[PDB]
């Protein structure tokens, strides 16, 4: 009756009447290799007895290219393997991760294990509802599903992308307000394995570009409103297959910040460029996955570096798209490897290493802390790494090119970090935030305000600054990524309310100076917890109020108000021992507000502020006024350009 025994035949035979040869197809082969419900679904989806005129119309609706342009191909090398030595390890079932030597990840792991780690969730694409029905046959794809679902107000193209080890699919569902759809599909991958088309289309006609390995397919109907059809797919394939991995990531990054340049990282009328950018992202992920898949033993260091690059790409893309979603990826074995590798780095060892082995460990931390589980030992390591690079920086007060990348890595490590348990670790992190806000000077702020105004040649991976980790709040065509990167720590600064009792609105707060057992709030407005200090020199239109609240939620120990500027020449270039330490120094001007802040931790610092190459002691104006602060809630003004 039903399907269970309808196949009493031994096999199915395909026959050609004009040729005296018989073709065969053993029935059990289809039943085992592909599932029975998939087989019946495939037969039903074919529309076997559909009228020829309907298939003709479906043929005319599509748009076809000129020819399958073939190029020398094979691209570049995205692959990295072990450097011809014995550091390779085969994780059998649960091989103990404490047996992995070293603290730099120079060893190698199984490539197939990490492959299954990236692709671990099955999917059933080309469902009965989606317009993938008419184009593609239904298929089961285990992949990392993306999503850029952008709206629902009769706008909102659903760009549900897919990244598999063999192919990349991306779609441009125009849900609109009716049943009809404009399903602009883009495919990229091995031409041999691809989602089979219906009877009204073929790859031999639709393959826009070809390589020795990779083919790009553009299955997009013509009658629909697609201005995107006026572009050279050959140029896209050249830009996507011939550049080095670093150049490809750079081009994706610059395209994304260009989308930021206009309102396209939030709007709808620029849907096709977002669609193409998402496609480029998916094929970059596919290229990385294929490069890892090519070998069988892969180096953890290079893998983690590539993962950090892809992570940063996903972060910036989510920074445009709040709705950006990425599901189905489970970096479990790599996470355990990184955890047990970085559980053997003491806080001193991390600071002692050179700035080429401080990036690898922190990339492992990034990989292992997607959930906010960074160990406190690594938090102290970050603390004294920032201390070391601060002491290096305090000599000439210029910033290089390895330290900014390292600082970006620690920024994204701390951003996706949950609050720790020990209060001392939180205090140390708060100290390092103070060190970063002392790092962000007027010149550095000028570099950022002038630098991000030109996204055409911008590259975030090198355009970083300590202001993207500092406690300064005065962030005030052009890219709007300043606050977009500031919020990644501002909303997740361990215990976000550094202020505890006098809860005041954070609208006109310029600075927070969190010294040990005292907190300073610099704002043009004022709090109501205790007395404040106000500058008498207010002849211009500005307000500068500073309050000193205790972390123990208590008022001032002394009620004396200044309301004046004490002028004295005291405390010149200090003596030996430790006269000034664990303190901060302000710098403000009557024409710009707050200029800079400085934190001192060791003798080298206060010996080093008084250099001619320091940002301070410059002749911009006749009148600059410094401030003296220490960790007991008193303000004494310093006058004198010595």
């Amino acid at each position, epitope marked *: 009756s039903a399907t269970q025994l309808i196949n009493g035949r031994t096999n199915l035979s395909i026959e050609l009447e004009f040729n005296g040869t018989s073709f065969f197809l053993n029935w059990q082969n289809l039943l085992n290799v592909i599932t029975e419900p998939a087989l019946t679904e495939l037969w039903t989806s074919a529309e076997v007895a559909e009228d020829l005129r309907v298939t003709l119309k479906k043929r005319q609706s599509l748009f076809f290219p000129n020819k399958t342009v073939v190029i020398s191909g094979d691209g570049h090398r995205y692959t990295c393997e072990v450097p011809t030595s014995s550091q390779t390890y085969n994780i059998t079932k649960g091989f103990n991760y404490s047996a992995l030597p070293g603290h730099l990840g120079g060893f190698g792991i199984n490539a197939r294990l990490v492959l299954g780690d990236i692709f671990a969730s099955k999917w059933s694409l080309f469902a009965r509802d989606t317009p993938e029905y008419r184009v593609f046959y239904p298929m089961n794809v285990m992949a990392v599903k993306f999503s850029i679902s952008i709206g629902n107000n009769e706008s909102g193209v659903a760009l549900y992308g897919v990244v598999s080890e063999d192919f990349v699919v991306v779609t441009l569902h125009n849900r609109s307000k009716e049943a009809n759809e404009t399903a602009s599909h883009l495919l990229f991958g091995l031409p041999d394995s691809l989602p089979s088309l219906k009877g009204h289309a073929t790859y031999d006609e639709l393959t826009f570009a070809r390589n020795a390995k990779y083919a790009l397919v553009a299955i997009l109907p013509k009658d629909s409103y697609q201005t995107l059809l006026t572009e050279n797919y050959t140029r896209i394939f050249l830009n996507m297959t011939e550049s080095t991995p670093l150049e490809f990531t750079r081009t994706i990054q610059t395209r994304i910040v260009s989308i930021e340049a206009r309102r396209a990282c939030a709007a709808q009328e620029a849907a096709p460029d977002i669609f193409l950018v998402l496609f480029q992202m998916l094929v970059a992920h596919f290229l990385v996955a294929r490069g890892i898949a090519e070998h069988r033993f892969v180096e953890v260091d290079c893998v983690c570096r590539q993962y950090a690059e892809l992570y940063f790409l996903r972060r910036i893309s989510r920074l445009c798209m709040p709705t950006f979603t990425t599901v189905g990826y489970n970096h479990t074995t790599l996470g355990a490897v990184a955890a047990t590798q970085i559980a053997r780095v003491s*806080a001193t*060892k991390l600071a002692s290493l050179p700035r080429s082995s401080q990036e690898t460990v922190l990339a492992m931390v990034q990989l292992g802390a997607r959930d906010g589980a960074v160990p406190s030992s690594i938090l102290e390591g970050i603390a004294m790494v920032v201390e070391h690079m601060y002491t290096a920086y305090t000599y000439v007060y210029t910033l290089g090119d390895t330290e900014r990348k390292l600082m970006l890595d620690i920024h994204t490590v701390l951003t996706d970090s949950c609050p720790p348990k020990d209060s001392g670790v939180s205090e140390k992190l708060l100290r390092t935030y103070l060190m970063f806000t002392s790092m962000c000077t007027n010149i550095e702020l000028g570099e950022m305000i002038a630098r991000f105004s030109k996204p055409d040649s911008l590259n975030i991976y090198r355009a970083f600054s300590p202001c993207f980790l500092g406690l300064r709040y005065d962030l005030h065509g052009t890219s709007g990524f300043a606050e977009l990167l500031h919020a990644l720590h501002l909303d997740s600064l361990n215990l976000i309310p550094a202020i505890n009792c006098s809860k005041i609105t954070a609208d006109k707060i310029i600075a927070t100076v969190p010294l040990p057992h005292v907190t300073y709030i610099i704002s043009s407005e004022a709090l109501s917890n205790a007395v404040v200090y106000e500058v008498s020199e207010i002849f211009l239109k500005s307000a500068m109020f500073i309050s000193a609240i205790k972390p123990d939620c208590s008022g001032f120990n002394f009620s004396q108000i200044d309301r004046h500027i004490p002028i004295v020449y005291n405390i010149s270039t200090p003596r030996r021992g430790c006269p000034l330490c664990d303190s901060v120094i302000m710098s403000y001007d009557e024409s710009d507000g707050l200029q800079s802040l400085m934190y001192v931790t060791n003798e080298r610092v206060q010996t080093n502020l008084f250099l001619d190459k320091s940002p301070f002691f410059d002749n911009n104006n006749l009148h600059i006024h410094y401030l003296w602060l220490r960790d007991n809630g008193t303000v004494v003004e310093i006058r004198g350009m010595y």
Partner: antibody
Amino acid sequence: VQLVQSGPEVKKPGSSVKVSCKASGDSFSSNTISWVRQAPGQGLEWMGRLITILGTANYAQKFQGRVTITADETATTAYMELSSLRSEDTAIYYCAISEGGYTYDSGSYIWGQGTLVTVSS
Amino acid sequence: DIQLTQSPSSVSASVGDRVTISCRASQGISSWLVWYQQKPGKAPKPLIYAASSLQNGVPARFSGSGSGTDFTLTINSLQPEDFATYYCQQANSFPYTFGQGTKLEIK
């Protein structure tokens, strides 16, 4: 096992000493230096420690203003200087390396042979 | 500030036996405790760091345990080289401190 330090000294009370500790193996910038003194017949007493990456040092309360631990530029020698050596300060002074956190030494600990500082008149 | 004690202050363990040295603190020091073994005159030879992890070269005949405020050094087997005045040093806070020294000798 063990490190290399200076020789034994006998010195007039009121003077200063410069007992030093040698790096036996890798460079000293990776670890932190703790100086521990032990009077004869007594248990050891911690004096001070120094995180040489920053150069910051912190010592106990009794030895405040007397013991000063500093690191050489090359990060291969530790110079402990004890000012105004006052009467009872004879001890087999020891230097101990320790690689660890910001305020706690967890990982490593190996000790030098220790110089025998004596007061004789 | 931080203060520790050791007990018992004397053990007449002969050889090849089990000896326990308790090191009781007065606050919490996590698990950062270092056991030493210092013969007279010579430098101390640290044995266990993190109160449970053996130092390099140290024989497995030493095994420590405990955390928070109670720690312990259960030496499984004894040799005359092991015989010395031990010290438990907290490695958690400032003004670090040692124990008064378990005076362990032969019977």
